[PDB]
């Protein structure tokens, strides 16, 4: 519920300071993307010719 | 009248019509004179809902109202726009979020340097500390894109953000806004590999719904179809199949054949079959079989592969498919003549005719009747005998032929008949054709009927003489065949096993690989012992291939040795030391098969039994000493010793009577006491501290640790050793 009655000094909220955006330094797709091999332990007991 | 405050206080309520409030207040606006007094009033009460970050529904209702109302000196929407752009750098996270939100909602509901200031301001907020603020900025800047104008600063930011933003929703946001352009397309399709399932699911929708099928290369279409089809979640599978495939299918007019042409069926046919099978299971048989008017001879590879994949499908839908299957296929025999007449039409480069040939040769195992078998075996034999036929089809024909015979002796005979035919007239490829039959005969042959005296004919006639053949393609199949024979009779293996080793060191590289396979399959089946009662050095030979320059040989040797160890047929702390080293060796970083194989073996081998772990414990010191003694030139000097020791201690934990770690603690204390100021002193102490020491070893260990504290001089290792001491004292 929002009380529109009491005169709140909204300057505290809208006022400017430091610092708004993420720093220039800050990353790669390596973090976002999945890495594409499969080795089943059964292949360890299996033959090459059959 | 209705004041802005009542209008807002009312919009706050859940069940309160907004269309009405617009009309009430809308008059209140025009009825006022000097609108600027209303303008300043509107923003003032709007501030009460711009300072709340959390999505309380009351706040959201007013925002929607204020935005809807406004978009249903210059003002009022322009007054509000001016105010938002001045407040978009406010210290409050809520305000910045609300500002972007309102700008977004405004830009979306409406029918001058304000467009420029928005584009500028939101482009800044794309870098906001708060993820949600960045999201609203993206949504805001969404309408302000321009695909045509190269290097738009919105599409650029989107291109950066869609791949580089830490936050999944920010990316997922940019993925739904980004305009499908030439440079943009790769980023969009690249989100089908995104870590977050929701992003991957969405990428298929945007692709299917915002990009045309033409825009994508044939190679991309297969990547999407394949990738999405075996993606970890059925949510992503269903997403691609529902939006993308059924969408790609729609552009074809719901025709599967036309769709196949677009997937480059010749090369990526396995993927095409998957697409087919997935598509088959969601359409009635009456329609799928409909695509076939009994065969029609002039066909494309897309047509051939379809019918082949459908016939195999229809045979799997057991009974119902029996009816629809008999619609497209003729009785087994009449198909044989059909198969035969095609193979004849083969001497611009129509690889395509070899491919289509395989598909029809492969349809054979969907036929069925004893008379028909003989007449299928008849044409199959005829085709195999006929020259000019490409060897690519040989293996496939032989397999289809051997499937039917049922009898190992009848197979060896039907085969013997065929080889003698090909051996009558007079080159190397005539030898290849024969050996291809020999191979495909040996591999499907059961162990019981090992080396029928008829086989020994072929072994003596074709297989053995093949090994010395001048043509390399001949030797390879010869070796492969010899190894398959050795598997049949143990005595046979013993005689020619020495020959197989000969091939290993002397012969060509691609033959070696076959040799390794042979030797390893035989060692795995008969053990090492029966072969040392001629080649006493067999273990030395296979081992020295770990240091091979050829990837296939490293991986062949390495894996073959790993297999022998896992089944307890080989016990060697040396070779196991050489394996662990090989796995860490930089020379192996791009040997994916090798590095992956061992990665599984070491753990599963270690925790299988104490004797296995004991093998690692025996190998502990020799490994780290092989490392410490490596000159700067070897790739081994690059290796990190601590990583290797930690792995060994890990594999040897009793969490997988003096335990193995107890013996280790001894070995290590004995080593530390031998050279307490060694360059590796740090490594050995860490290994010591991370061990899982038994309780009863503490008194004996304490004795050792005290003396170690006397001789060890590195203050770093000492503080760690004292720390171990207090634990024992407990």
Author numbering:
A (entry chain A): 460 to 485, 490 to 499, 501 to 514
B (entry chain B): 7 to 78, 92 to 130, 137 to 318, 326 to 379, 393 to 413, 416 to 473, 478, 554 to 659, ...
Paper quotes:
It is composed of five subunits: two SMC (SMC2 and SMC4), a kleisin (CAP‐H), and two HEAT‐repeat (CAP‐D2 and CAP‐G) subunits. SMC2 and SMC4 dimerize through their hinge domains to form a V‐shaped heterodimer, and CAP‐H, which belongs to the kleisin family of proteins, bridges SMC head domains through its C‐ and N‐terminal regions.
As the most C‐terminally located motif V was predicted to bind to SMC2 21, we thought that motif IV (residues 461–503) may be responsible for binding to hCAP‐G. With this information, we aimed to express and purify hCAP‐G complexed with a fragment of hCAP‐H. We found that the N‐terminal domain of hCAP‐G (residues 1–478) connected to the C‐terminal domain of hCAP‐G (residues 554–900), and a fragment of hCAP‐H containing motif IV (residues 460–515) was able to be co‐expressed and co‐purified. Consistent with the recent assignment based on its amino acid sequence 5, hCAP‐G displays a “harp‐shaped” structure composed of 19 HEAT repeats (H1‐H19), in which H12 and H15 have long disordered loops (residues 479–553 and 661–691, respectively). hCAP‐H, which comprises three α‐helices (α2, α3′, and α4), binds to the concave surfaces of hCAP‐G. Second, hCAP‐H is more loosely bound to hCAP‐G than the yeast counterpart, resulting in the more opened conformation of the HEAT‐repeat subunit hCAP‐G. The distance between R257 and V754 of hCAP‐G is 17.06 Å, whereas the corresponding distance between R287 and F749 of YCG1 is 6.25 Å. The previous electron microscopy study also demonstrated that the HEAT‐repeat subunit of cohesin loader, Scc2, adopted several flexible conformations. These observations of the structural flexibility led us to speculate that our hCAP‐G‐H structure represents a snapshot of an “open conformation”, whereas the structure of its yeast counterpart represents a snapshot of a “closed conformation”. hCAP‐H interacts extensively with the concave surface of hCAP‐G at four major sites, whereas YCG1 interacts with BRN1 at five major sites 17. At site IV, there are notable hydrogen bonds formed between H512 and L513 of hCAP‐H and D647 of hCAP‐G.
